[PDB]
Amino acid sequence: DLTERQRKVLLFIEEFIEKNGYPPSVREIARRFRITPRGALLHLIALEKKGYIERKPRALRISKSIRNKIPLIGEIRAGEKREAIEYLEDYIEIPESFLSSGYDHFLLKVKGESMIEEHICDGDLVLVRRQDWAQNGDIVAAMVDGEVTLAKFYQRGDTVELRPANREMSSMFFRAEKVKILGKVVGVFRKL
Amino acid sequence: DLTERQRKVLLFIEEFIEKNGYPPSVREIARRFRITPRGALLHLIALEKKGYIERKNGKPRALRISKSIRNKIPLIGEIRAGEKREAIEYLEDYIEIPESFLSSGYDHFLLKVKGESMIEEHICDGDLVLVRRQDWAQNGDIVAAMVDGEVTLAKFYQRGDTVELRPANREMSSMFFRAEKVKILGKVVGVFRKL
């Protein structure tokens, strides 16, 4: 079991390898985490103990990846300056072919029938790629007036439409900046 | 990498240890899979080399799982009519699926959905369906079935001598068969969609 700090150090190492094509040095980890090189080495040694990495400098291999362990978020609240306050419930391993390199992702459990005509059902998980922008027609996770919803996003001029995919429901329209885009729905996972 | 036989050997080893508290022998593995004792041993050697198992000092009673493959699910690219066999399956790839979607005590496979036959159950062309391997079904189950040499996804109903394979699509016809002619490949238990 990883501590919060160990998880963050391991993700940094994995992401550095993905970006650069070789492992980070102890000094690089120390810079990232604002700790001494000695402190960074201590995290490396711990990750090696728990079997997540194998260890000249940069002699580092990932033995157990956590990059595809995607956070499942439940509640999201509007905080200071409407920053999204996310309440993590779990991490779920998502198959690599469903994830885009280059983005972070989270999962949400679908509540209700707002997206049923897009074949997204109550109880599904949606895989959300984190982004604060959207194109018209994108299925987004958005927050407005402290409500998180899934909807198709449209902007025309100063107005954003959050359009359900359900003939029993109506679209909602807002002054554009009131709508915080949390990300774009890029996968759906359903247990029957 | 693994063959299907090797994956299934590893699943058997892991479940056997869980149930019994000791690992199966070479001959227990051979009889389980209708392969030769020598064949079973060659697999253990290969799987140890691949890091999936350990056998300290090469002793059978020390056989243990080092890397579980319980999440590794075969994507089957083709299932076609056989001659001696009803169905012949071709492995396309493996996809990692969380155990939360899997039923304990069963094996599973994935199929890529082709067409609109299940659209009213919100299963779309290009989705993967996770199929739990079983050769029976209950009314209202979504099944992968082989009938008349062809594989379909449908809702299953049985009323005595007759099975109905009902598409979840108003515009497509239910198909009715003598019950004994319907080979159930398994029950759809999950749906995975990449947008």
UniProtKB/Swiss-Prot annotation, chain A:
<keyword id="KW-0238">DNA-binding</keyword>
<dbReference type="InterPro" id="IPR015927">
    <property type="entry name" value="Peptidase_S24_S26A/B/C"/>
</dbReference>
<dbReference type="GO" id="GO:0006260">
    <property type="term" value="P:DNA replication"/>
</dbReference>
<keyword id="KW-0742">SOS response</keyword>
<keyword id="KW-0378">Hydrolase</keyword>
<dbReference type="InterPro" id="IPR006197">
    <property type="entry name" value="Peptidase_S24_LexA"/>
</dbReference>
<dbReference type="GO" id="GO:0043565">
    <property type="term" value="F:sequence-specific DNA binding"/>
</dbReference>
<feature type="site" description="Cleavage; by autolysis">
    <location>
        <begin position="78"/>
        <end position="79"/>
    </location>
</feature>
<keyword id="KW-0227">DNA damage</keyword>
<dbReference type="GO" id="GO:0001217">
    <property type="term" value="F:DNA-binding transcription repressor activity"/>
</dbReference>
<comment type="subunit">
    <text>Homodimer.</text>
</comment>
<feature type="active site" description="For autocatalytic cleavage activity">
    <location>
        <position position="151"/>
    </location>
</feature>
<dbReference type="InterPro" id="IPR036390">
    <property type="entry name" value="WH_DNA-bd_sf"/>
</dbReference>
<dbReference type="GO" id="GO:0032993">
    <property type="term" value="C:protein-DNA complex"/>
</dbReference>
<keyword id="KW-0804">Transcription</keyword>
<comment type="function">
    <text>Represses a number of genes involved in the response to DNA damage (SOS response), including recA and lexA. In the presence of single-stranded DNA, RecA interacts with LexA causing an autocatalytic cleavage which disrupts the DNA-binding part of LexA, leading to derepression of the SOS regulon and eventually DNA repair.</text>
</comment>
<feature type="active site" description="For autocatalytic cleavage activity">
    <location>
        <position position="114"/>
    </location>
</feature>
<dbReference type="InterPro" id="IPR006200">
    <property type="entry name" value="LexA"/>
</dbReference>
<dbReference type="InterPro" id="IPR039418">
    <property type="entry name" value="LexA-like"/>
</dbReference>
<dbReference type="GO" id="GO:0004252">
    <property type="term" value="F:serine-type endopeptidase activity"/>
</dbReference>
<keyword id="KW-0678">Repressor</keyword>
<dbReference type="GO" id="GO:0006508">
    <property type="term" value="P:proteolysis"/>
</dbReference>
<dbReference type="GO" id="GO:0006281">
    <property type="term" value="P:DNA repair"/>
</dbReference>
<dbReference type="InterPro" id="IPR050077">
    <property type="entry name" value="LexA_repressor"/>
</dbReference>
<protein>
    <recommendedName>
        <fullName>LexA repressor</fullName>
        <ecNumber>3.4.21.88</ecNumber>
    </recommendedName>
</protein>
<keyword id="KW-0068">Autocatalytic cleavage</keyword>
<dbReference type="GO" id="GO:0009432">
    <property type="term" value="P:SOS response"/>
</dbReference>
<keyword id="KW-0805">Transcription regulation</keyword>
<dbReference type="Pfam" id="PF00717">
    <property type="entry name" value="Peptidase_S24"/>
</dbReference>
<dbReference type="InterPro" id="IPR036286">
    <property type="entry name" value="LexA/Signal_pep-like_sf"/>
</dbReference>
<keyword id="KW-0235">DNA replication</keyword>
<dbReference type="InterPro" id="IPR006199">
    <property type="entry name" value="LexA_DNA-bd_dom"/>
</dbReference>
<feature type="DNA-binding region" description="H-T-H motif">
    <location>
        <begin position="26"/>
        <end position="45"/>
    </location>
</feature>
<comment type="similarity">
    <text>Belongs to the peptidase S24 family.</text>
</comment>
<dbReference type="InterPro" id="IPR036388">
    <property type="entry name" value="WH-like_DNA-bd_sf"/>
</dbReference>
<dbReference type="Pfam" id="PF01726">
    <property type="entry name" value="LexA_DNA_bind"/>
</dbReference>
<keyword id="KW-0234">DNA repair</keyword>
<dbReference type="GO" id="GO:0045892">
    <property type="term" value="P:negative regulation of DNA-templated transcription"/>
</dbReference>
